Structures are given as C-alpha cells and as structure tokens.
Amino acid sequence: PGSSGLPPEKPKNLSCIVNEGKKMRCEWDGGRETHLETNFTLKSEWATHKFADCKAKRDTPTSCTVDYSTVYFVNIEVWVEAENALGKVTSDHINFDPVYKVKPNPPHNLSVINSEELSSILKLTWTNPSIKSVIILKYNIQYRTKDASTWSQIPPEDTASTRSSFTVQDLKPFTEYVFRIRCMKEDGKGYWSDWSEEASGITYEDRPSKEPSFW
Amino acid sequence: GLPPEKPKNLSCIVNEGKKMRCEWDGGRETHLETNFTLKSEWATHKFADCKAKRDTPTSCTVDYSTVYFVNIEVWVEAENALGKVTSDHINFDPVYKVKPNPPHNLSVINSLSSILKLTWTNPSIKSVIILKYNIQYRTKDASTWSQIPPEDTASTRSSFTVQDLKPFTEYVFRIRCMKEDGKGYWSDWSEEASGITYEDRPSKEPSF
C-alpha cells in the first residue's frame, strides 16, 4: 500500500508447451512488480476460430493452461495481455502448430535383458508414449555402471527415429549397468520428456577370459 | 561479358542455434551482373532458395531451421545473361557440419600443488552429438599454449583434472569442443579461466 503503482510491462518470452495428454500451457515473464495486481489473459485462436481466454490465476500470474483440447496439425495464434489500473499492454504474438510444442511422457516399461549370449552387451526394450502416432520420436539413451558417478550417452544419431529396443555393446563383463531414456519429436522441435525410470541389468561373466586364465 | 563459371568448393556449416550457412568460390570475373542462389532440399521437400546478398556473393544463410538426422541435398546456381550453371551437389546430414558454442562457465577449482580441477557447462547440442574437446593451459606468463592429449578428452564430460602442474603457479585454461567423430567444426575457444597451484616445500627447496 505504501508502494507506488506502475503500468504493466509488456509481457515477454512467451512460450507454450503441450505435455502429452494434458491441455496446452503457456508461460511468460510478467516483468516488474506493479503493486496493482496485474491481470494476465492468454489469448489464442485458430485462423478459423477464437478460443476461450485463459485467465491466469492469483498464485501463478505468469502461467495459464487453456480450456480446450489440443488439436495437432493446426496453427494457433497466441499472445498475452497484461492489465491493471494504470494500463493495458499486449505481448508479441507467436504462431505455431502444437505438434512442435510437445513434451512426451518418458518411455515406460523399460527393462534390461541379456541377449545373444555375449558378456559385452545388454538389450533395452520399452514402450513408447502414445504420442508416437502423432510424432516420430528421437531419443537420448544413457547408461553407466552402478558405481559410476556420471552418465554415458549413446550417440543421438543412432537413436534418432521411433524404436522400442536398443542393444548397448562394448560393455564390461559381469558388471551391473543402470539405464535411462528420454524422447521428443525427431526434428528437435518440442521439449525433451523427463527421464524414464532407471532400469538395471548385469552382463554375463566372460567365459573366454575365465578359460584363457585357467589355461 | 562472360558466362558464370561453375561454382566450386561448396561447404556448409551449422553454427549451434543458428541457421545453416553455405560458402563457395564464385570463380572468374564475368564482368556481368551475376546472381548466386543456394538451392537445398530433402528428398521429401524442396526448401526455399537462398539468394546471396550483393556485399557477400559467395555465401548464403538459409531461412529454415536446421533438422538433424536428415540428409539434405545442396548446390549453388550461378546465373547471368550469358548462362546458368550449377556446382556439384553435396549431400549431408547437418549433424556432421555443426560448430558448437564453446563450453561456458569454465572454472578452476583447488580445494593441492600440482593439480587443478576444471569444470564447465557443455553446449545444449550435447543432446544431439557426443562431444570431444581440446583443453589447453599455460602459465600466466607463457606466450604459447600447451594441450592436454585429445585422446583423454574424447567424449562428453563437464570436468577434468589437470595434473603434473608446477607448484606456486597461476595457470590459464581454455576449452573448445566439436563432434566426437571429428566430423564438423571446432567451436570457438571458451572464455579463459585461471587458478593457482599451492605450496610444495620440496619443490621450493630444490629450486632455491
């Protein structure tokens, strides 16, 4: 109350995100405190329709989750208008197809299995998120020994397209490995999903080495 | 008045976060107004021609965003009143033409007399390519730079312990990175970072 009122600063850094299966949410920077309880309204519309205004809540004034279901393959015009007693200002408009703003759920049912009888490999199998029918997925597959302090990563160009399994090679024998994987749209337009649950597996003992040692 | 020569030595580079830029040798002076157009396309989509500006006729920066993991056909078309000619086409995946941003937040830790630990933050392109580095160091007074064997910094990492350093010395370090397989371009050197090695009474006795 002792503070001095100010007009709303033009909202900046507007960006939207469609978490898989959830309604679109847009974020922005409201600027400096105006001391006048600025009201933010997320406006959005298709060239063929005007959607319901999204009124940013009290707790989170610089964020809003729309009321309508996401419809991929159609461009939407989005912008935010800030308003208080001293003025009304609108951010710059952004136009995009939500298919390029998806943050998929991480792959699930991640399991590590021994295969080919080799003591230097471990195979990963998993179930891709349902969004795979809307976008082609690319991944980041990471692995490390149980005792390792850091994660190693499979060359992203080797996991650049939708798949549900991957064989990691050149691993140490009789060693426990932990794995994790994340995904996003293949073209890099969108957001990486959170890391999947970690899954572990143990490589076979090296028979040839045990033989050559006994000999 | 001469027809344009076939453009040669076409190459492209994708500076991290920036649009692809291609460069070529225009060749002999035609003495006529000649246009240079960078033609590019996926087998599934023809991209927008990039007309080279007047001030920089042997270069063009495309208007489309880079899509890694997809091969793209690229060539240059030179043209004046006496004829049209295209360079040999090149085909590549932009993932092998990246010049990453240098690593940042390079800091030197020492919570030792011959060991200085380095920590940094890798560019975001690390989620697209595995990174290899060139870490260089030198005494705060030396003119030339020394280099850590590149084989010891061949894959993505955000820390490195530099050993076998001289005590009672301030060192200056810098680091650059590129794709692990050597296909691409080295990033610019990071901002330099400094640190000091502590006492070694044994090394002081020998020197004094």
Cα within 13 Å of Cα(A102), Cβ side: 29
Q: How far are the Cα atoms of B87, B141, B157, B175 from residue B138, in angstroms, in the given order?
A: 45, 8, 21, 12
Considering CB atoms only, which of B65, B95, B155 is closest to A157?
A: B95
Note whether A69 contacts B: Cβ–Cβ < 8 A.
no
Q: What is the resolution of this structure in A?
A: 2.0
Could you identify the residue written with the tokens 């960078």?
Answer: B38
Which of B67, B71, B126, B127 to mutate to test binding with chain A, by most A CBs within 10 Å of its CB?
B127
Identify the structural domains of chain A with CATH numbers, from first to last.
Answer: 5-104 (2.60.40.10), 105-213 (2.60.40.10)
Report the gap between the CA of B162 and the closest CA in chain A (Å): 18
| Whether B154 contacts chain A with CB within 8 A | no
**Distance in Å, alpha carbon of A34 to nearest chain B alpha carbon:** 34
B130 to A156: CB separation less than 8 angstroms, yes or no: yes
In sequence order, the 6+-apart residues with CB closer than 8 A to the CB of B57 are B26, B34, B36
Q: Is B118 on the interface with A (CB under 8 A)?
A: no
Q: Report residue B185: phi and psi, to 5°.
A: -130, 145
The reply to whether B125 touches chain A by the CB within 8 Å rule is no
User: What is the distance, to the nearest Å, from the Cα of residue B65 to the centroid of all Cα atoms in its chain?
Assistant: 18
Report the C-alpha gap between A80 and A53 in whole angstroms: 10
3-state SS, one letter per residue, for chain B:
CCCCCCCEEEEEEEECCCCCEEEEECCCCCCCCCEEEEEEEECCEECCCEECCCCCCCEEECCCCCCCCCCEEEEEEEEECCEEEECCCEEECHHHCEECCCCEEEEEECCCCCCEEEEEECCHHHHCCCEEEEEEEEECCCCCCEECCHHHHCCCCCEEEECCCCCCCEEEEEEEEEECCCCCCCCCCCCCEEEECCCCHHHHHHHC
Experimental method: X-ray
